[PDB]
Design an enzyme around this catalytic site. Structure first.
Site, short mmCIF file in Angstrom:
data_model
loop_
_atom_site.label_atom_id
_atom_site.label_comp_id
_atom_site.label_asym_id
_atom_site.label_seq_id
_atom_site.Cartn_x
_atom_site.Cartn_y
_atom_site.Cartn_z
N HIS E 61 0.70 -1.32 0.22
CA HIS E 61 0.02 -0.08 0.07
C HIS E 61 0.89 1.34 0.09
N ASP E 91 11.32 21.71 -25.01
CA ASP E 91 11.21 20.47 -24.48
C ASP E 91 12.10 20.47 -23.35
N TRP E 126 7.22 -0.59 4.76
CA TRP E 126 7.77 0.22 3.45
C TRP E 126 9.03 0.98 4.16
N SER E 156 15.16 5.99 -11.70
CA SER E 156 14.52 6.74 -12.45
C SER E 156 14.13 8.22 -11.94
N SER E 157 14.11 8.62 -10.51
CA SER E 157 13.76 9.95 -9.98
C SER E 157 15.23 10.54 -9.95
N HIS E 240 12.85 11.24 5.49
CA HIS E 240 12.15 12.55 5.66
C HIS E 240 12.23 13.41 4.41
N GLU E 242 12.25 12.65 1.71
CA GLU E 242 11.03 11.94 0.91
C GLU E 242 9.60 12.64 0.93
N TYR E 244 8.91 15.57 2.14
CA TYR E 244 8.78 17.12 1.72
C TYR E 244 8.82 16.96 0.01
N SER E 255 -0.34 27.05 -4.95
CA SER E 255 -0.24 28.20 -5.33
C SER E 255 -0.88 28.58 -6.81
N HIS E 290 13.85 12.15 14.04
CA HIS E 290 12.40 12.24 14.78
C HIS E 290 11.61 10.79 14.41
N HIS E 291 12.07 10.15 13.72
CA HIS E 291 11.60 8.79 13.41
C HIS E 291 12.38 7.79 14.21
N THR E 316 6.60 26.96 6.67
CA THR E 316 5.38 26.46 6.30
C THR E 316 4.28 27.33 6.68
N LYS E 319 3.80 30.23 4.13
CA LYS E 319 2.93 29.59 2.86
C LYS E 319 1.43 29.78 3.13
N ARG E 438 0.69 0.43 15.68
CA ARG E 438 0.55 0.33 14.03
C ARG E 438 1.05 -1.16 13.57
C1 HEA Z 1 3.43 14.63 2.66
C2 HEA Z 1 3.95 14.21 3.77
C3 HEA Z 1 4.34 14.95 4.99
C4 HEA Z 1 4.77 16.06 5.66
C5 HEA Z 1 4.63 17.49 4.59
C6 HEA Z 1 5.17 15.95 6.79
C7 HEA Z 1 5.48 16.88 7.90
C8 HEA Z 1 5.52 16.91 9.30
N1 HEA Z 1 5.66 15.64 9.76
FE1 HEA Z 1 5.41 13.97 9.22
N2 HEA Z 1 5.02 11.85 8.41
C9 HEA Z 1 4.73 11.53 6.82
C10 HEA Z 1 4.43 12.57 6.00
C11 HEA Z 1 4.50 14.16 6.28
N3 HEA Z 1 4.95 14.74 7.33
C12 HEA Z 1 4.85 9.99 7.05
C13 HEA Z 1 4.27 8.97 5.84
C14 HEA Z 1 4.97 9.64 8.20
C15 HEA Z 1 5.48 8.57 8.91
C16 HEA Z 1 6.45 7.54 8.60
C17 HEA Z 1 6.58 6.14 8.89
O1 HEA Z 1 6.79 5.99 10.19
O2 HEA Z 1 6.00 5.26 8.20
C18 HEA Z 1 5.24 10.72 8.78
C19 HEA Z 1 5.98 10.65 10.13
C20 HEA Z 1 6.26 11.56 11.05
C21 HEA Z 1 6.93 11.41 12.50
C22 HEA Z 1 7.35 10.36 13.36
C23 HEA Z 1 6.40 10.35 14.49
C24 HEA Z 1 6.79 8.61 14.84
O3 HEA Z 1 6.61 7.82 14.34
O4 HEA Z 1 6.56 8.59 16.12
C25 HEA Z 1 7.17 12.71 12.89
C26 HEA Z 1 7.76 13.29 14.11
O5 HEA Z 1 8.42 14.48 14.39
C27 HEA Z 1 6.80 13.62 11.83
C28 HEA Z 1 6.72 15.22 12.17
C29 HEA Z 1 6.47 16.05 10.99
C30 HEA Z 1 6.45 17.54 11.34
C31 HEA Z 1 6.87 18.66 12.13
C32 HEA Z 1 6.06 17.99 10.18
C33 HEA Z 1 5.98 19.29 9.33
O6 HEA Z 1 6.69 19.59 8.07
C34 HEA Z 1 4.69 19.99 9.25
C35 HEA Z 1 4.52 21.74 9.19
C36 HEA Z 1 3.27 22.22 8.81
C37 HEA Z 1 2.66 22.96 9.76
C38 HEA Z 1 3.10 23.08 11.24
C39 HEA Z 1 1.13 23.53 9.49
C40 HEA Z 1 0.92 24.87 9.03
C41 HEA Z 1 1.74 25.90 10.00
C42 HEA Z 1 0.95 27.18 10.31
C43 HEA Z 1 -0.29 27.48 10.28
C44 HEA Z 1 2.01 28.19 11.32
C45 HEA Z 1 1.90 28.35 12.76
C46 HEA Z 1 2.29 26.84 13.33
C47 HEA Z 1 2.72 26.65 14.80
C48 HEA Z 1 3.04 27.76 15.50
C49 HEA Z 1 3.12 25.25 15.07
N4 HEA Z 1 6.27 12.80 10.90
C1 HEA Z 2 0.41 8.81 -0.67
C2 HEA Z 2 0.58 8.19 0.29
C3 HEA Z 2 -0.58 7.26 0.96
C4 HEA Z 2 -2.14 7.54 0.74
C5 HEA Z 2 -2.62 8.32 -0.45
C6 HEA Z 2 -2.69 6.63 1.38
C7 HEA Z 2 -4.18 6.67 1.39
C8 HEA Z 2 -4.99 5.48 2.23
N1 HEA Z 2 -4.30 4.96 3.37
FE1 HEA Z 2 -2.42 4.77 3.57
N2 HEA Z 2 -0.28 4.53 4.19
C9 HEA Z 2 0.42 4.94 3.78
C10 HEA Z 2 0.63 6.04 2.62
C11 HEA Z 2 -0.62 6.51 1.94
N3 HEA Z 2 -1.84 6.07 2.37
C12 HEA Z 2 1.83 4.73 4.51
C13 HEA Z 2 3.06 5.34 4.11
C14 HEA Z 2 1.38 3.85 5.40
C15 HEA Z 2 2.55 3.23 6.13
C16 HEA Z 2 2.97 2.01 5.89
C17 HEA Z 2 3.97 1.10 6.83
O1 HEA Z 2 3.49 0.77 8.10
O2 HEA Z 2 5.06 0.44 6.54
C18 HEA Z 2 -0.01 3.70 5.42
C19 HEA Z 2 -0.47 3.02 6.37
C20 HEA Z 2 -1.93 2.86 6.42
C21 HEA Z 2 -2.65 2.38 7.43
C22 HEA Z 2 -1.97 1.68 8.54
C23 HEA Z 2 -1.77 0.16 8.19
C24 HEA Z 2 -1.26 -0.28 9.85
O3 HEA Z 2 -0.57 0.24 10.60
O4 HEA Z 2 -1.57 -1.53 10.09
C25 HEA Z 2 -3.95 2.51 6.98
C26 HEA Z 2 -5.11 2.04 7.91
O5 HEA Z 2 -6.38 2.31 7.74
C27 HEA Z 2 -4.18 3.27 5.84
C28 HEA Z 2 -5.21 3.53 5.08
C29 HEA Z 2 -5.45 4.28 3.80
C30 HEA Z 2 -6.68 4.52 3.19
C31 HEA Z 2 -7.95 4.14 3.80
C32 HEA Z 2 -6.44 5.50 2.44
C33 HEA Z 2 -7.35 6.09 1.31
O6 HEA Z 2 -7.45 7.63 1.77
C34 HEA Z 2 -6.97 5.99 -0.12
C35 HEA Z 2 -8.08 6.54 -1.27
C36 HEA Z 2 -7.63 6.53 -2.57
C37 HEA Z 2 -7.09 7.69 -3.06
C38 HEA Z 2 -7.00 9.02 -2.04
C39 HEA Z 2 -6.22 7.65 -4.33
C40 HEA Z 2 -6.03 8.72 -4.96
C41 HEA Z 2 -5.46 9.05 -6.35
C42 HEA Z 2 -5.59 8.42 -7.38
C43 HEA Z 2 -6.51 7.09 -7.56
C44 HEA Z 2 -4.95 8.67 -8.86
C45 HEA Z 2 -6.01 9.44 -9.99
C46 HEA Z 2 -5.45 9.64 -10.93
C47 HEA Z 2 -5.26 10.71 -11.65
C48 HEA Z 2 -5.83 12.13 -11.01
C49 HEA Z 2 -4.36 10.72 -12.89
N4 HEA Z 2 -2.77 3.48 5.42
O1 LIG Z 3 8.63 12.19 7.73
O2 LIG Z 3 7.44 13.41 8.51
CU LIG Z 4 10.19 12.69 9.10
#
Ligand code: HEA
Ligand code: HEA
Ligand SMILES: [O-][O-]
Ligand SMILES: [Cu+2]
Ligand SMILES: CCCCCCCCCCCCCCCCCC(=O)OCC(COC(=O)CCCCCCCCCCCCCCCCC)OC(=O)CCCCCCCCCCCCCCCCC
Ligand SMILES: CCCCC/C=C\C/C=C\C/C=C\C/C=C\CCCC(=O)O[C@H](COC(=O)CCCCCCCCCCCCCCCCC)COP(=O)(O)OCCN
Ligand SMILES: CCCCCCCCCCO[C@H]1OC(CO)[C@@H](O[C@H]2OC(CO)[C@@H](O)[C@H](O)[C@@H]2O)[C@@H](O)[C@H]1O
Ligand code: CUA
Ligand SMILES: [Mg+2]
Ligand code: NA
Ligand SMILES: [Zn+2]
EC number: 7.1.1.9
Lengths: 259, 104, 46, 227, 514, 75, 144, 93, 57, 49, 84, 43, 71
Positions: E61, E91, E126, E156-157, E240, E242, E244, E255, E290-291, E316, E319, E438
């Site tokens: 998934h 291009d 993953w 690829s990337s 991490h 990744e 971003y 935007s 932080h992971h 952030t 933005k 989890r």
């Molecule tokens: C698109 C993906 C995305 C983004 C953009 C971010 C953004 C952040 N993530 Fe997250 N994160 C994931 C996707 C993302 N993350 C995924 C997949 C995982 C789990 C990995 C795994 O274990 O499998 C994950 C897991 C993960 C963990 C580990 C938690 C754990 O496993 O125990 C942590 C911890 O620090 C974390 C923290 C943060 C923080 C600070 C940000 C920050 O960048 C976000 C900052 C944004 C805002 C704060 C909001 C807007 C701000 C304002 C309106 C201004 C004012 C705000 C304040 C004064 C606070 N993330």
């Molecule tokens: C982008 C990343 C992404 C997205 C979109 C999702 C979407 C969803 N995820 Fe996912 N999830 C992860 C990344 C993502 N997840 C990751 C990284 C983990 C952790 C893995 C690990 O633990 O190792 C996880 C874990 C996770 C768990 C925890 C498993 C566990 O700990 O046992 C669950 C359980 O409910 C869950 C559910 C869902 C559901 C119901 C959606 C639904 O919201 C989905 C509905 C469908 C969409 C939102 C599809 C959208 C787009 C298209 C179909 C393309 C269309 C095409 C064009 C426009 C060209 N996810």
């Molecule tokens: O990685 O949030």
């Molecule tokens: Cu991180």
């Protein structure tokens, strides 16, 4: 008809054959490791060599023969190579990180010391020093080759380039020998792991760089390079320097500090 | 710059006797981007510019934009029309309301 | 040189909306079915 | 344990866990405020026919929306780090207990004086006694003295696991070849549950942790009878 | 003709379309897997089998949604389609290499599907942590096939990132500085820099795991002096950045969408938006541990990583506020795309904020490895990244195809998805505070309610996905050809009509230096 | 003796060296006394500590190895 | 009046509040009477009739502000259709519960729950606020 | 000696760019054009090889926003934002 | 050696509409055919292998 | 001239709402789903030991 | 550092070739001399079956699965000791 | 955006067919596997 | 005749009024939270442990038979 200076590349089958050859190499390694067979691997390796050969053949055709590399196209290629090297440096970084992680905090299993108990490191003042002087020398001789090419001196360009390649090859042979003489192996714990994998990827790059210098050698024999337009040679020489620098870090890290 | 200097710049802008159609449009399309409903004196100079370029519809369109730029402040438009009545009368410009163009 | 313009800059045909329906169905349908059938496959092994 | 329809943290069983409830409350407030503020402003921007589409100046309002969030961060960090450093203070334990993770159960070692050790396995659902909790009960509980500072050492003998007990604010990963420390101190007697907190294969979901917190005197007798 | 066009392409628009198609298909696979996840957890008990099959499903998934849906659509699709257009470029710098970036993905995807087919699949997460991912707890081909899949996706990337960087630096009109490029173009280049620096580190990490599994190395094996924790560092050093990478192109399209439907000629605070993306880009490289707040690192280290992780909120924040400031005084067009963008602004903020909760190592001890993390990341991925993709997709569909969508149907699709994702993920905050770990196939009884509701929510989401296919069908079936588009003066990509010709900018734009 | 006291040389969550060091300490001490005709009982502290701290399998694996000649630690 | 695909590079018509005067006139080809009306417009506008004034407006513009700004009934169709497909989703969940899901664990039986609940209280699960705090250990009942 | 020069050996578009630059021309649009005063009587002359070309207008120095529009053969057109003038000068290369 | 670049320039610039990968003459076609056959062959082969490895033995 | 929403708007809304509420109520209460609500206030504690 | 020599008037091909033959290759001949001298088989150490060495968690994908890729009988013992 | 009327209008009836067919291509195979899960689990 | 109304800065004026409102609500809500949640939580813990007898608590548990080590 266009009025910009950029290249519109003819549709090409090499992206697809390079992709598929990637599938065959990885699929092949899997079949080798788990299903004791090398056929797939052999095929993927073959197509990859064919792909690389044809694709760079065509780059030469498009540039030396068809004139598509305007200064703007050439400038794009400099960035592409700079960026490529950058990603290569980060890759090595992973392996140095691994070396420094294991060697700075040796675990009980190794005797809690570095080098581990039962490991007898090579002497950095022996073939490792030789290898170092060989690479540093080839850096000098390739600068000479660059200046000769820029001064339009054909003979001394080829002479300096030859010297450079021979040095490259000497390094490889020395390293091959050292591999065989080493009392430790890749299976000798984290010491063997970090040692052979880091230097082994380095040695792979010395081979690639060398091959690339050789291509430059034959293109020069056939007068492809002008005293002013020779990006293939520049690339190879940047790459060659990257390779020399990676070795200086392996030398200082693993062979010297790591002993 | 002050409020009166702003208005004057715009009055002078629309009053240029040889003002062409492009300048009329540019000026109106620019002006409606600001956080104000234009003063009656500015709208008057633009209406008269419509006259010199023989463009009746742009004159009406301009009255409409005034109304639009007031949003929910329902009191602005009827004040502006009141202040432009001599001008409307002098040039024979009918209001969008008078032409039926305010009904959806 | 190639066809240009709406319905012509794509590798599938949009000439007939029913044949297109069938394609899209195979395409999105095959993708969504694959995991269900891998699960089936894994349960029928052991 | 958790109870049906629970919203927040399990009730604090240790002073450290209380400390986290308050810090979480403080943070969540900030989180509600800012997200509701954003939701509000969003709606404010979308609810007027008044327009202003010309170029706007940014180098002035950008100050506010840089300095405020910075401040708010410092107001989260301050208590965050205070608790962090507290959780690390020297404490002088009366007792050291080890735990090894295995696929899929835990073993305990109480080796200060005698050589006490046993395995702890989940009670199968079919063998639960009336009123016992599905997935959560173990055959051999982890008897510990209440109101005392214990040292929990955690490790693994195969893959990763992680030893957690939410009511005490504990989660220490179990890594083979490494010995992680944490300190435990229940303010109350009772049973405290937890579950393996690192994916570890086929039965990751089924290798829970039950702590039994009784008085010193009952812990000593238990230890003896358990030799 | 067909093969020369679609297997041998050198055309940035065709390649972009190959990518959208790949991504859309991956998106379906990823939705199936996620429904498998919620089916298993929709009632107490075991549905499929133990944790092995369940985690094979969970693992795929993630790999599918991230490497095959989000990245391809965002960088491969929208990136190739729009970036050349937005800078008046004929291009990409390396149109031939660009095609190999594409064709590496089907093979890569095949290897992921292979790994789940052979033996018992890779039930590792993953993140693929050893020793569980090692040759003893996960013996046979599955994990090696998974590693190879990541290698191909990674090459690829990396090649993609080189193309994008060179294209954006080297191929703008001679008069246009970097500060006159639109923000989508900026977001793509910064994402590309992140890809270039971070993927090779993942490469190094998973290769070490490969050799540990097949060449008797002991990088992560204590018996030879290795450390499972080292792997975690290498993965997360990439992991991490990744995230971003997954959100930045998002920010870019947000935007443009917000500016466009606000009837605005430019985004508020352009230079502040540029600064913001660079800062997030850099900060996102110094925070990976932080992971790892529970692996047992020194308190000083955990104090540093807590603080460096929080600072990311400042840029952030700028933005988020600027997007609101862009809406301010707008002439608001309530299009489907604008609805996705509004949803994004809000939901992303919530996910972002809970990300800040998790930044606190103290609290994270209790939050780590529970559903609280799962809720944070689906807010910002299922309601962040995916919402940016939906918005950008409906917005730009007419440019790509020359046909229009039915706005009303698309507004319906958004409402259904909005209810769906919020019902799926909101309650997961409750499950996580209260301790549900989890990667579990079943849970203690007390957690039954929130798991039932959350699964019901995933079904709503299914309905929206199916409806989306139908809406794309309707557009191609009705054939309403595009005529006029407003705001072309500040949206160059639309200026060559819909669809633009195969070759555009054969004669480059004229731009004065003054 | 209740348990191994806090040791300022090993103040962090990772206690692996604390176990290892006291294991080495005890056996070096035991060797020195058994060399110089002396009482092993001075070494007792380290045995108590390392017994408190070290997992059974670690101690058991390390004892087997000392017996085998393959103990990598220097004793 | 009639716009063509291959006209994308030419200035066009638009009805927008914040662009009151488009780049071109809505109608560019005039009939005999329309031509006459454009001539008449060179004279005093007071001599123009209401119908002629309206007719000139319509040559220049397509819709009035009131027309382009009008609200619709679309929300009814969106909200109604949303609820319909969200409605449809329960059909799937019904089908799932019937044909996919077996019975749930015996620990949810009424008596099992009654006993487990007693035990929770005996062990004082969440005694400060969560669970047991809500039980009166004196009157032996849930706190009213 | 022995090594070709660009003069002796550059071909195709490379040679075209090289020769044209020597005569001080830019047929391949490598340089950014210099602006005139952009008035009605002094419009910016926009070379083209067809009857229309896209112009990008950076109204004021350091704007980040670029105004794009098709410039058609015919009478001068003005930037929709700053009103400066541009006139197409078709054909050749 | 003599400089024969100008001949090769003549050959590859020749207006026959042939893509650069084929422009060298008949050898290009052979080599292309061998490459692409090995690629498509080997891929079919890998699929077969994957099918084999999918079931227990 | 009236469009789809003027003609069908009220019906789509009324019956979409009606149908939605009907089938969710039915699914929530008649097919044997276990919601597992809090015992607090609903369950009479029973002797277990 | 500035090294200990001079030129810099113009760094061209003549200078770099001067460096190739006057510094670089002479350094390589020196290190080649030094090496083909301190070489000569060093007495292989006593075998001890340490647990962190000669790792085998899966056999090698070549030979008998127990021999490292560049196995040297003289200096590389197997997990059970040197070879016959 | 403005556009031209559909070159090949898709009537309500036709949209129903396409919607139905679309849903069924996602629903039927998954339904089939899910319904037969038990016959897979023990076989 | 109608009086000249305000015609400049209507949007800014509207913005000013509502941001100040949003501030006021925020303080009003801070107050609420730090009374209905924060203080409620601190007081419940302080009240529970004030006169808490752990041996008594243990004894009730012991007599209910929950323990393995204490019958
Ligand atoms: C698109 C993906 C995305 C983004 C953009 C971010 C953004 C952040 N993530 Fe997250 N994160 C994931 C996707 C993302 N993350 C995924 C997949 C995982 C789990 C990995 C795994 O274990 O499998 C994950 C897991 C993960 C963990 C580990 C938690 C754990 O496993 O125990 C942590 C911890 O620090 C974390 C923290 C943060 C923080 C600070 C940000 C920050 O960048 C976000 C900052 C944004 C805002 C704060 C909001 C807007 C701000 C304002 C309106 C201004 C004012 C705000 C304040 C004064 C606070 N993330
Ligand atoms: C982008 C990343 C992404 C997205 C979109 C999702 C979407 C969803 N995820 Fe996912 N999830 C992860 C990344 C993502 N997840 C990751 C990284 C983990 C952790 C893995 C690990 O633990 O190792 C996880 C874990 C996770 C768990 C925890 C498993 C566990 O700990 O046992 C669950 C359980 O409910 C869950 C559910 C869902 C559901 C119901 C959606 C639904 O919201 C989905 C509905 C469908 C969409 C939102 C599809 C959208 C787009 C298209 C179909 C393309 C269309 C095409 C064009 C426009 C060209 N996810
Ligand atoms: O990685 O949030
Ligand atoms: Cu991180
Ligand atoms: C779906 C299940 C709902 C179940 C409800 C609870 C049952 C009550 C029992 C009975 C309740 C009373 C008695 C028990 C008190 C327990 C207190 C406690 O232990 O304390 C901690 C608890 C308790 O916290 C709460 O007190 C719940 C807060 C719920 C916020 C409501 C927003 C919901 C919006 C609309 C519907 C939801 C779906 C949309 C989600 C939209 C995303 C926010 O747990 C949490 O921390 C969960 C929150 C995670 C953080 C998300 C933060 C940002 C949210 C969004 C801001 C929106 C602002 C505008 C307002 C938003 C308007 C749109
Ligand atoms: C002369 C110096 C030059 C080195 C190259 C020489 C040829 C060997 C084959 C290819 C090497 C390629 C890359 C490096 C990868 C693996 C480590 C190889 C380094 C090496 O060659 O080390 C040797 C072990 O080789 C072994 O296992 C050999 C294993 C051979 C199979 C290679 C494994 C295939 C897996 C490769 C990983 C590919 C992933 C990279 C992805 C790229 C980024 C996307 C050392 O021999 P030993 O007997 O243990 O000790 C000597 C004692 N007398
Ligand atoms: C996570 C995503 C899953 C989404 C939920 C699926 C929604 C509805 C699935 C409908 O499709 C199915 O319905 C059946 C009946 O309801 C099945 O027939 C079975 O049932 C019969 C009657 O009970 C027999 O007629 C047949 O032999 C047959 O195999 C079955 O084939 C299946 O295709
Ligand atoms: Cu042990 Cu999960
Ligand atoms: Mg963890
Ligand atoms: Na389950
Ligand atoms: Zn301008």
């Amino acid at each position: 008809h266009q009025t910009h200076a950029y290249h519109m590349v003819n549709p090409s089958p090499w992206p697809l054959t390079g992709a598929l050859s990637a599938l065959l190499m990885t699929s092949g390694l899997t079949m080798w490791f788990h299903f004791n067979s090398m056929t797939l691997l052999m095929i993927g390796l073959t197509t990859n060599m064919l792909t690389m050969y044809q694709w760079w053949r065509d780059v030469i055709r498009e540039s030396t023969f068809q004139g598509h590399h305007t200064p703007a196209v050439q400038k794009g290629l400099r960035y592409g190579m700079i960026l490529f090297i950058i990603s290569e440096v980060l890759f090595f970084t992973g392996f140095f990180w691994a070396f420094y992680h294991s060697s700075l905090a040796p675990t009980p299993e190794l005797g809690g010391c570095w080098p581990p108990t039962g490991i007898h490191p090579l002497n950095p003042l022996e073939v490792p020093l030789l290898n170092t002087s060989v690479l540093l020398a080839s850096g000098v001789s390739i600068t000479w080759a660059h200046h000769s090419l820029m001064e339009g001196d054909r003979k001394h360009m080829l002479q300096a380039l030859f010297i450079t390649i021979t040095l490259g090859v000497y390094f490889t042979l020395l390293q091959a020998s050292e591999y065989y003489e080493a009392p430790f192996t890749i299976s000798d714990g984290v010491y063997g792991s970090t040692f052979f994998v880091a230097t082994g990827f380095h040695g792979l790059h010395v081979i690639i760089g060398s091959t690339f210098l050789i291509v430059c050698f034959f293109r020069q024999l056939k007068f492809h390079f002008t005293s002013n337009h020779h990006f293939g040679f520049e690339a190879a020489a940047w790459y060659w320097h990257f390779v020399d620098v990676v070795w200086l870090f392996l030398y200082v890290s693993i062979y010297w500090w790591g002993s | 710059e002050t409020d009166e200097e702003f208005d004057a710049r715009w009055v002078t802008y629309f009053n240029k006797p040889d003002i062409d159609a492009w300048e009329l449009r540019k000026g109106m399309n620019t002006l409606v981007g600001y956080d104000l409903v234009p003063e009656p004196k500015i709208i008057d100079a633009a209406l008269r510019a419509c006259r010199r370029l023989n463009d009746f519809a742009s004159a009406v369109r301009i009255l409409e934009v005034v109304k639009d730029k007031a949003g929910p402040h329902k009191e602005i438009y009827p004040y502006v029309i009141q202040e432009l009545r001599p001008t409307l009368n002098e040039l024979g410009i009918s209001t969008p309301e008078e032409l039926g163009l305010d009904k959806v | 040189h190639y066809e240009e313009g709406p319905g012509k800059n794509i590798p599938f045909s949009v000439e007939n909306k029913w044949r297109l329906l069938a394609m899209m169905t195979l395409f999105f349908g095959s993708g969504f079915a694959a995991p269900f059938f891998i699960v089936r496959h894994q349960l029928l092994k052991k | 344990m958790a109870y049906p329809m629970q919203l927040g943290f399990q009730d604090a069983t240790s002073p450290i866990m209380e400390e986290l409830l308050h810090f979480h409350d403080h943070t969540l407030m900030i989180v509600f405020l800012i997200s509701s503020l954003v939701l509000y402003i969003i709606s404010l921007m979308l609810t007027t026919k008044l327009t202003h589409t010309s170029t706007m100046d940014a180098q002035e309002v950008e100050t506010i929306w840089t300095i405020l969030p910075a401040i708010i961060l410092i107001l989260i960090a301050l208590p965050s780090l205070r608790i962090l450093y507290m959780m690390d203070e020297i404490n002088n334990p009366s007792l050291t207990v080890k735990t090894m993770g295995h696929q899929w159960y835990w073993s305990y070692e109480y080796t200060d004086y005698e050589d006490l050790s046993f395995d702890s396995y989940m009670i199968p659902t079919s063998e639960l006694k009336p009123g016992e909790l599905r997935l959560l009960e173990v055959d051999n509980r982890v008897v510990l003295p209440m109101e005392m500072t214990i040292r929990m050492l955690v490790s693994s003998e195969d893959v990763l696991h992680s030893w957690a007990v939410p009511s005490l604010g504990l989660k220490t990963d179990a890594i083979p070849g490494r010995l992680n420390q944490t300190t435990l101190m229940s303010s109350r007697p009772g049973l405290y549950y937890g579950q393996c907190s690192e994916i570890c294969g086929s039965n990751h979901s089924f290798m829970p942790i039950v702590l039994e917190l009784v008085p010193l005197k009952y812990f000593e007798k238990w230890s003896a009878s358990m030799l | 003709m067909f093969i020369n066009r679609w297997l041998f392409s050198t055309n940035h628009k065709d390649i972009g379309t190959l990518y959208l198609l790949f991504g859309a298909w991956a998106g379906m696979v990823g939705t199936a897997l996620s429904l498998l996840i919620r089916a298993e957890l929709g009632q107490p008990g075991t549905l499929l089998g133990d944790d092995q099959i369940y985690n094979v499903v969970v693992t795929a998934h993630a790999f599918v949604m991230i490497f095959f849906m989000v990245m391809p659509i965002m960088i491969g699709g929208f990136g190739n389609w729009l970036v050349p257009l937005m800078i008046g470029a004929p291009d990409m710098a390396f149109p031939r290499m660009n095609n190999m970036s594409f064709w590496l993905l089907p093979p890569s995807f095949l290897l992921l599907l292979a790994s789940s087919m052979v033996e018992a699949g890779a039930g590792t997460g993953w993140t693929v942590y050893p020793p569980l991912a090692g040759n003893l707890a996960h013996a046979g081909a599955s994990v090696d096939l998974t590693i190879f899949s990541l290698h191909l996706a990674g090459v690829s990337s990396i090649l993609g990132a080189i193309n994008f960087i060179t294209t954006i630096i080297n191929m703008k009109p001679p008069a246009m500085s970097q500060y006159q490029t639109p923000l989508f173009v900026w977001s793509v280049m910064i994402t590309a820099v992140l890809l270039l620096l971070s993927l090779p580190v993942l490469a190094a990490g998973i290769t070490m795991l490969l050799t540990d599994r097949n060449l008797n190395t002991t990088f992560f094996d204590p018996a030879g002096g290795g450390d499972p924790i080292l792997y975690q560092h290498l993965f997360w050093f990439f992991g991490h950045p990744e995230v971003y990478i997954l959100i930045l192109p998002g920010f870019g399209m947000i935007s443009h969408i917000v500016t466009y439907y606000s009837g605005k000629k430019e985004p508020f605070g352009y230079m502040g938006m540029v600064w913001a993306m660079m800062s997030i880009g850099f900060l996102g490289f110094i925070v990976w541990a932080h992971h790892m707040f529970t692996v047992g690192m020194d308190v000083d280290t955990r104090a540093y990583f807590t603080s460096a992780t929080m600072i990311i909120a400042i840029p952030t924040g700028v933005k988020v506020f600027s997007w609101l400031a862009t809406l301010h005084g707008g002439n608001i067009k309530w299009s489907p795309a604008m609805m996705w963008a509004l949803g994004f602004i809000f939901l992303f903020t919530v996910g972002g904020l809970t990300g800040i909760v998790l930044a606190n190592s103290s609290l994270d001890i209790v939050l780590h490895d529970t559903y609280y993390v799962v809720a944070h990341f689906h807010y910002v991925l299922s309601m962040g990244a995916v919402f940016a993709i939906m918005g950008g997709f409906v917005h730009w569909f007419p440019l790509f195809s020359g046909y229009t969508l039915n706005d009303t149907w698309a507004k319906i699709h958004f409402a259904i998805m909005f209810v769906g994702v919020n019902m799926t993920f909101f309650p997961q905050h409750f499950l996580g505070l209260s301790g549900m770990p989890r990667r579990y196939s079943d849970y203690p009884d007390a957690y039954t309610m929130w798991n039932t509701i959350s699964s019901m929510g995933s079904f709503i989401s299914l309905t929206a996905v199916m409806l989306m296919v139908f809406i794309i069908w309707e557009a191609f079936a009705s054939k309403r050809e595009v005529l006029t588009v407003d705001l072309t003066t500040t949206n160059l990509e639309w200026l060559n009509g819909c669809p633009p010709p195969y070759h555009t900018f054969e004669e480059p734009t004229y731009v004065n230096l003054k | 003796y209740q348990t191994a006291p806090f040791d300022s040389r090993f103040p962090n969550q990772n206690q692996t060296r604390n176990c290892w060091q006291n294991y080495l300490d005890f056996h070096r001490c035991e060797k020195a006394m058994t060399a110089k005709g002396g009482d092993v009982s001075v070494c007792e502290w380290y045995r108590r500590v390392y017994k408190s701290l070290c997992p059974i399998s670690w101690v058991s694996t390390w004892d087997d190895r000392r017996a085998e000649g393959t103990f990598p630690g220097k004793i | 009046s009639v716009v063509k695909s291959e006209d994308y590079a030419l200035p066009s018509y638009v009805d927008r509040r914040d662009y009151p005067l488009p780049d071109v006139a809505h109608v560019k080809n005039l009939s005999a009477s329309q031509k006459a009306l454009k001539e008449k417009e060179k004279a005093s506008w007071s001599s123009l009739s209401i119908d002629e004034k309206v007719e000139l407006y319509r040559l220049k513009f397509k819709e009035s502000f009131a027309e382009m700004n009008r609200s619709t009934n679309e929300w009814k169709t969106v909200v109604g259709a949303a609820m319909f497909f969200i409605g449809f989703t329960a059909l799937l969940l019904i089908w799932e519960k019937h044909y996919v899901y077996g019975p749930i664990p015996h620990t949810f039986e009424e008596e099992w729950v009654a006993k487990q609940t007693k035990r929770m209280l005996d062990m004082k699960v969440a005694p400060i606020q969560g669970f047991s705090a809500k039980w009166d250990y004196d009157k032996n009942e849930w706190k009213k | 000696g022995g090594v070709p020069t660009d003069e002796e050996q550059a071909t195709g578009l490379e040679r075209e760019v090289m020769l044209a630059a020597r005569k001080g021309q830019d047929p391949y649009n490598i340089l950014a054009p210099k602006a005139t005063s952009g008035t009605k009587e002094d419009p910016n002359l926009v070379p083209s090889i067809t009857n229309k070309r896209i112009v990008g207008c950076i109204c004021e120095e350091d704007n980040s926003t670029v105004i794009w529009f098709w410039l058609h053969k015919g009478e001068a057109q003005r930037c929709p934002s700053c009103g400066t003038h541009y006139k197409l000068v078709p054909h050749q290369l | 050696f003599e400089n024969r670049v100008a001949e090769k320039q003549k050959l590859f610039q020749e207006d026959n509409g042939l893509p650069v990968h084929l422009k060298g003459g008949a050898t290009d076609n052979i080599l292309y055919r061998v490459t692409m056959t090995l690629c498509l062959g080997g891929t079919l082969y890998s699929l077969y292998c994957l099918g084999w490895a999918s079931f227990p033995h | 001239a009236p469009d789809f929403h003027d003609k069908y708007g009220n019906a789509v809304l009324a019956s979409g709402a009606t149908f939605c509420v009907a089938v969710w109520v039915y699914m929530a209460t008649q097919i044997g789903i276990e919601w597992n609500p809090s015992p607090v206030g609903r369950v009479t504690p029973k002797e277990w030991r | 550092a500035s090294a200990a020599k001079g030129d810099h008037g113009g760094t061209g091909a003549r200078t770099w070739r001067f460096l190739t033959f006057g510094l670089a290759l002479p350094s390589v001949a020196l290190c080649t001399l030094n090496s083909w001298l301190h070489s000569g088989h060093r007495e292989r150490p006593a075998f001890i079956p340490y647990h962190h060495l000669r790792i085998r968690t899966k056999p090698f994908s070549w030979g008998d699965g127990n021999h490292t890729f560049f196995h040297n009988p003289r200096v590389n013992p197997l997990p059970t000791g040197y070879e016959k | 955006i403005t556009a031209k009327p559909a070159k090949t209008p898709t009537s309500p009836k036709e949209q129903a067919i396409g919607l139905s067919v679309t849903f069924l291509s996602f629903l039927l195979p998954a339904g089939w596997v899910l319904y037969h899960l038990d016959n897979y689990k023990k076989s | 005749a109608l009086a000249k109304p305000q015609m400049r800065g209507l949007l800014a004026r509207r913005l000013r009024f509502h941001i100040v409102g949003a501030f006021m609500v925020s303080l009003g809500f801070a107050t609420f939270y730090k009374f209905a949640v924060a203080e409620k939580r601190k007081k419940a813990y302080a009240d529970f442990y004030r006169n808490y007898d752990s041996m008594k608590d243990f004894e009730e548990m012991r007599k209910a038979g929950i323990f393995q080590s204490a019958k």
